[PDB]
């Protein structure tokens, strides 16, 4: 189950979510979504905090969404970056 760090609602846009979703489904792999903005304009301090630590030990260099994560490993990347993970 891949973890997608992005937005799944009317509180935020998301293009890669549409393709990335069918992407994993097409390859025949399960996954789970995660919204980093559970409010009309407020990110999730809980996930955001763990997100940074999950990334590494630096800062968010223009961190964009959606950001996927290994179902049981480490950060994989976005859509295209992940497509490489799926080959």
């Amino acid at each position: 189950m891949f973890k997608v760090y992005g937005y799944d609602s009317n509180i935020h846009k998301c293009v890669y979510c549409d393709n990335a979703k069918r992407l994993l489904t097409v390859k025949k792999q399960p996954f789970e979504f995660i919204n980093i903005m559970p409010e009309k304009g407020v990110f999730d301090d809980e996930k955001i905090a763990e997100l940074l630590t999950k990334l590494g030990r630096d800062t968010q260099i223009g961190l964009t969404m959606p950001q996927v994560f290994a179902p049981d490993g480490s950060h994989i990347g976005g859509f295209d970056q992940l497509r490489e993970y799926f080959k």
Side-chain angles (χ1 to χ4, degrees):
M1 200 178 302
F2 294 88
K3 277 80 146 265
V4 159
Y5 285 26
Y7 303 67
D8 250 36
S9 204
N10 206 250
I11 325 207
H12 206 266
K13 223 263 249 223
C14 41
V15 296
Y16 295 135
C17 181
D18 196 87
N19 41 62
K21 179 178 221 190
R22 190 157 149 167
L23 187 171
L24 320 184
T25 308
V26 168
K27 259 102 219 88
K28 219 98 262 265
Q29 313 287 302
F31 57 99
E32 246 292 21
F33 206 77
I34 317 171
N35 306 345
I36 64 147
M37 169 123 42
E39 210 135 16
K40 67 154 265 166
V42 195
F43 332 143
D44 201 85
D45 58 77
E46 315 255 71
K47 318 241 96 205
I48 270 71
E50 166 130 59
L51 203 181
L52 307 195
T53 306
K54 268 175 136 72
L55 292 221
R57 62 162 51 77
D58 316 332
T59 181
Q60 55 231 277
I61 181 56
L63 191 287
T64 44
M65 297 95 212
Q67 277 289 47
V68 201
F69 282 92
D72 59 283
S74 288
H75 183 246
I76 302 144
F79 184 51
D80 200 292
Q81 267 209 266
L82 176 139
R83 209 177 174 77
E84 210 182 283
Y85 185 103
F86 276 75
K87 267 212 171 163

